[PDB]
């Protein structure tokens, strides 16, 4: 997405400096707006910007939303060290503590 | 225990070389470079880690010294323009019999 933003911005700079009919300049400005759109929130407007494998790309907003977002996946609950896991078996000879 | 490669041969005791059976006298540090080349035969050599291991870490000189030293190795044993001591651009050198 950042590469798309950079490409659109550089091409718009070239169009402005060279001097082009206003239709092409307007099209480039629209592409810049849609590229920043995709960067900040992919799929919010129109069909989402898609890469290889035909899957929506993960914009900044998608990195802060839902279960898989940072807030409820890395901040609230984290994978911890000094821990393990195993099957349980009844211990009827053990004490309560 | 003598270390051999193609037509160059080294004795670890008295620090001399045979090139295709002909004994050759060579400089000490230049000999250390050749020792690195044979001890890592078939593996590419880059100027930096060559500087790191063979040379002291206090070396404040430029980078032309290693290129010149490779030139001496060429003119001493691999006098041919094409040589067993191939050079990689930006990646350094390597000891390898050409295919």
């Amino acid at each position: 997405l950042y590469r798309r933003v950079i490409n659109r911005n550089n091409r718009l700079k070239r169009l402005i400096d060279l001097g082009a009919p206003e239709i092409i300049v307007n099209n480039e400005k629209r592409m810049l707006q849609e590229s920043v759109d995709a960067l900040f929130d992919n799929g919010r407007r129109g069909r989402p910007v898609t890469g290889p494998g035909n899957r929506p790309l993960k914009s900044l907003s998608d990195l802060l939303k839902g279960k898989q977002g940072r807030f409820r996946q890395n901040l609230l609950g984290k994978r911890v060290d000094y821990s393990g896991r195993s099957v349980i078996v009844v211990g009827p000879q053990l004490k309560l503590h | 225990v003598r270390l051999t490669f193609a037509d160059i041969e080294l004795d670890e005791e008295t620090h001399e070389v045979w090139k295709a059976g002909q004994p050759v006298s060579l400089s000490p540090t230049e000999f250390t470079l050749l020792r690195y080349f044979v001890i890592n035969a078939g593996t590419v050599l880059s100027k930096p880690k060559i500087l790191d291991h063979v040379w002291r870490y206090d070396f404040g000189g430029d980078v032309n010294v290693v290129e010149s030293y490779v030139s001496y190795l060429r003119r001493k044993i691999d006098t041919g323009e094409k040589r067993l001591l191939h050079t990689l651009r930006g990646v350094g050198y390597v000891l390898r019999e050409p295919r």
Partner: protein, 49 residues
Amino acid sequence: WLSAASFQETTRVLTDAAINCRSDKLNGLKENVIIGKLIPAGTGINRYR
């Protein structure tokens, strides 16, 4: 805003807080859990800490 943004409708509350220039106090339970501070309950209050 930090607690609300981590519960539901993250983008909406985030935008609203950005507009309102809301200054969070970082005093609640979830905020202290997020930032690594002692939670303000149990052995986290100044009476016991």
